[PDB]
Swiss-Prot record, chain C:
Entry protein name: Serine/threonine-protein kinase MEC1
Subunit structure: Interacts with LCD1, which is required for localization MEC1 to the RPA complex. Interacts directly with the RPA subunits RFA1 and RFA2.
Function summary: Serine/threonine protein kinase which activates checkpoint signaling upon genotoxic stresses such as ionizing radiation (IR), ultraviolet light (UV), or DNA replication stalling, thereby acting as a DNA damage sensor. Recognizes the substrate consensus sequence [ST]-Q. Recruited in complex with protein LCD1 by the single-strand-binding protein complex RPA to DNA lesions in order to initiate the DNA repair by homologous recombination, after the MRX-complex and TEL1 are displaced. Phosphorylates LCD1 and RPA2, a subunit of RPA, involved in DNA replication, repair and recombination.
Similarity-based family: Belongs to the PI3/PI4-kinase family. ATM subfamily.
Top-level lineage group: Eukaryota
Compartments reported by the entry: Nucleus
Curated annotation (Swiss-Prot), chain D:
Top-level division of the source organism's lineage: Eukaryota
Post-translational modification, as annotated: Phosphorylated by MEC1 in a cell cycle dependent manner and in response to DNA damage.
Lineage of producing organism: Eukaryota, Fungi, Dikarya, Ascomycota, Saccharomycotina
Quaternary assembly: Forms a complex with MEC1.
Protein name as annotated: DNA damage checkpoint protein LCD1
Subcellular location: Cytoplasm; Nucleus
Length: 134, 554, 121, 107
């Protein structure tokens, strides 16, 4: 509660805000926290795709593409995740295949990593959107 | 026999015309009007901006700021004055809009649409000082975007195409770079179309160096080439040729130019020309440095040449919300843009034909330029021109004729002109040819000559029937256009006055016979004869020529 | 002939916006029985085809799929000096909303196959 | 105008007629959220190379008059635009009232 209200009332602390709020899976909120800075977009685009409004997803991916050269290691994954969920609600089993394959091409290059490194459940995040994609 | 005065026109003032035209222009392809596109612009990350009584607030209407400046300066300036004033202001604009860390450049291209509409509008007595101001400003703008035309030769195994997938800033800078080179094009051609008097006053070695930077950036030999910039750059080379063939003592501008730079241009022309035409995948990616593949990434007209699908046009409109003053463009899919009818592919076959027209056309032009020799004057012109002649002879006959597609007509008119090129060589330039060169390729030149020396049978027509049969076999597409044209689009294609129905028949006869690889012009064969059958070099003494004579009959 | 050919050529072609400004015939259109004078009327008809909203109905007089007239001016060859008929009727025919077919109609499948076999015998 | 800050037509360019979601009179469409302003100047400029001085006058008078009436008879419609348009028409008839004809004036 307080942590939100401080985020309103800061951006490094607001980074902490969005981080903790995504951590409590409160996507149905973060969609509404500050839909109307860079380390925040993943936080945002996730809930954007997660809840499932065709208009909200549209607006979020719109700001994302409006950036000049994101270039960033992170967002493009969630970006594709969403950018499939336009073709779904507009029915192209070809466009969707193209974008989801491009999702594979991404995930299997950068976020994917070395072999073992001490953990599995930690990677389960990276792997679990993968599973659901299928 | 006087004719009376006619001053009672309600004359539209030239300044007023210019004003209203800019004020409501819509570009070829989009949906929205220029000035109002402008009216949906805010320049944000530069919270104040100002050069010359041209304040703009932070969240201010860019577009209204335009129309303001426009109208106020209207009752100030005359036509040309209004041009140069805009040019300076918009120039300062673009320059800073460029030099800025977090600034997005949405406005820039659209203002470049301005650039065109504007500078094109009336180039009559416009002065090269202003022209060059804009010009240099944009060349070095380009070197501010020199980070484009030298992107690598291919996508490396590690280099990914996983992407924000935006066609936005790609199309952004693509429009930018192109439109900018397109400036280069347009203003430089307004230079060429200015009175000859106002010429050398603009040409300094700065033109050589700046355009040298951009050319090297552009017609890469170690990166991806990029067909549009390929175009633009090479016609600027053509602009050089133009000032050559136009300045009575063009030796002035030639001496201005540097030998190394003539080389770094003509050599890269060779790099261009020994590529190939394959409508098979003109619309995908293949062996590089060999295919001018205009991909959807940059496929529209270009600010002149109405090349085809122009498939980006309305997507220009989709760039602004067309409802709200804004700074960064509206999203577009990189891939929705672009099996139905490859007739667009064949429109383009005609166009890339016009391109290789340009290739041989500039090479002809420089040919005639250098009545005296030079350093890049080396004979590899003879080699490679004859070489292209050979290849579009042999592969001509084995592949491209008979494929019922009207590309062949221009594909052959090409080499029919190269005939003039070589015949120019025979008349003029046979006081340099190196034994080195003649016996490095005794092969291909003799091939070229004998290609019509075996054609000179001159023993085909004799009737209508066989050739009209040839026609029914091949000329299907050519007749599709022939009948569209005779049935749709001509004054002369009705009411033949009884002296041209025979023109129909024999002209179609000659065109179809000239379609099937054989019996080229009597002028062709005798002009080629005056080259080989004349013994000016020891290609053909009888002792080693009668084996070909008998191989023709004789 | 002239006016007909001109606007025919124009129609389908994306340069609607080329036309929009530089020439509306609002005055000499004069389709109130006032105002050769019966030929700019076909260009007015194709401009109504451009209007297009669904009020147009099914093809009755063999003309185009006509629209509510209370109107519909003439047949596809209002003036037909043997070439104007061609130009107009062709253009108006395009209002309908092949190479292989070309020669077939020039000399006007499986059945076509074996009928070809026997007729060529 | 005397007193305000902004340009007349340009005031107009920040107007949208909402509670009447559409109108059409004479090649004068206006979309729902359309740029009334660019719709004004739109009609203006477009009919420019159409009409002449007096002719463009009476034409715009009739159009913008119909516009007033449209903005007039509607329950929930706000009338914001209306008063700006009246000033616009005054300006027009005040600019060049030469050898015109009254019928438009009377209309």
């Amino acid at each position: 509660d307080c942590f939100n209200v401080l985020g309103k009332f800061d951006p490094k602390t607001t980074t902490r805000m969005l981080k903790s709020m995504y951590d409590h899976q409160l996507y149905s909120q973060i969609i509404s926290n500050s839909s109307f800075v860079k380390e925040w977009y993943s936080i945002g685009l996730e809930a954007a795709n997660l809840e499932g409004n065709v208009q909200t997803l549209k607006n979020w991916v719109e700001q994302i593409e409006s950036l000049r050269n994101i270039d960033d290691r992170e967002v493009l994954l969630q970006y594709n995740i969403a950018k499939a969920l336009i073709a779904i609600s507009n029915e192209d089993p070809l466009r969707t295949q193209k974008y989801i394959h491009n999702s594979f091409r991404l995930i299997g290059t950068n976020f994917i990593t070395s072999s073992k490194e001490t953990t599995l459940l930690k990677k389960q995040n990276l792997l679990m959107k993968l599973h659901s994609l299928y | 026999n006087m004719v009376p005065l006619n001053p009672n026109r309600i004359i539209p003032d030239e300044t007023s015309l210019f004003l209203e035209s800019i004020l409501l222009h819509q570009i070829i392809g989009a949906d929205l009007s220029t000035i109002e596109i402008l009216n949906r612009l805010k320049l944000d990350y530069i919270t104040e901006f100002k050069f010359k009584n041209f304040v703009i607030a932070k969240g201010a209407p860019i577009g209204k700021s335009i129309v303001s400046l426009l109208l106020r300066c209207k009752k100030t300036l005359t036509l040309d004055r209004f041009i140069d004033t805009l040019l300076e202001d918009i120039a300062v604009l673009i320059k800073e809009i460029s030099v800025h860390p977090n600034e997005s450049k949405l406005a820039v291209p659209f203002l470049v649409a301005l650039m065109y509409q504007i500078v094109q509008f009336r180039p009559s007595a416009t002065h090269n000082l202003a022209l060059k101001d804009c010009f240099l400003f944009i060349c070095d703008l380009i070197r501010i975007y020199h980070h484009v035309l030298k992107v690598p030769i291919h996508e490396s195994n590690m280099n990914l195409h996983v992407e924000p997938q935006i066609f936005q800033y790609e199309l952004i800078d693509y429009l930018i770079i192109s439109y900018s080179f397109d400036l280069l094009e347009g203003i430089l051609r307004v230079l060429q179309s200015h009175p000859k008097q106002t010429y050398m006053e603009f040409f300094d070695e700065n033109i050589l160096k700046s355009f040298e930077f951009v050319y090297k950036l552009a017609l890469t030999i170690s990166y991806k080439p990029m067909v549009n910039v390929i175009f633009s750059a090479v016609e600027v080379v053509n602009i050089i040729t133009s000032i050559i063939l136009n300045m009575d003592n063009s030796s002035d501008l030639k001496s201005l130019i540097s030998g190394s730079w003539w080389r770094d241009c003509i050599t890269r022309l060779y790099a261009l020309l020994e590529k190939e035409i394959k409508s098979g995948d003109v619309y995908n990616e293949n062996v590089d440095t060999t295919t001018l593949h205009m991909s959807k990434y940059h496929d529209f007209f270009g600010l002149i040449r109405n090349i085809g699908d122009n498939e980006l046009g309305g997507l220009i409109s989709k760039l602004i919300y067309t409802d709200r003053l804004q700074s960064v463009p509206r999203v577009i899919s990189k891939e929705d843009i672009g099996f139905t009818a490859p007739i667009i592919g064949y429109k383009m076959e005609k166009w890339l034909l016009k391109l290789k027209d340009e290739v041989l056309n500039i090479f002809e032009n420089l040919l005639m330029i250098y009545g005296d020799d030079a350093t890049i004057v080396n004979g590899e012109m003879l080699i490679h021109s004859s070489k292209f002649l050979s290849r579009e002879q042999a592969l001509m006959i084995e592949r491209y004729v008979g494929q019922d597609s009207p590309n062949l007509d221009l594909r052959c008119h090409l080499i029919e002109h190269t005939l003039t090129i070589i015949y120019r060589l025979w008349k003029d330039h046979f006081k340099q040819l190196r034994e080195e060169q003649i016996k490095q390729v005794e092969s291909q030149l003799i091939m070229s000559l004998w290609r019509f020396l075996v054609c000179q049978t001159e023993t085909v027509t004799a009737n209508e029937r066989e050739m009209r049969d040839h026609r029914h076999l091949v000329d299907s597409l050519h007749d599709l256009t022939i009948k569209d044209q005779a049935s749709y689009y001509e004054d002369a294609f009705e009411d033949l006055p009884e002296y041209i129905e025979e023109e129909l028949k024999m002209q179609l006869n000659k065109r179809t016979g000239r379609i099937m690889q054989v019996k080229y012009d009597e002028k062709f064969q005798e002009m080629a004869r005056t080259i080989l059958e004349s013994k000016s070099f020891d290609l053909t003494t009888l002792e080693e020529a009668d084996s070909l004579y008998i191989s023709m009959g004789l | 002939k002239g006016i007909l050919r001109l606007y025919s050529l124009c129609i389908s072609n994306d340069f609607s916006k080329c036309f929009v400004d530089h020439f509306p015939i609002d005055q000499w259109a004069d389709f109130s029985q006032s105002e050769t004078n019966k030929a700019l009327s076909i260009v007015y008809f194709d401009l109504k085809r451009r209007s297009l909203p669904v009020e147009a109905l099914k093809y009755d007089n063999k003309f185009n799929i006509w629209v509510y007239q209370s109107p519909d001016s003439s047949l596809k060859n209002v003036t037909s000096p043997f070439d104007d008929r061609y130009k107009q009727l062709e253009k108006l025919r395009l209002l309908v909303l092949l190479l292989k077919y070309r020669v077939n109609q020039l000399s006007p499948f499986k059945l076509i196959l074996n009928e070809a076999s026997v007729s060529i015998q």
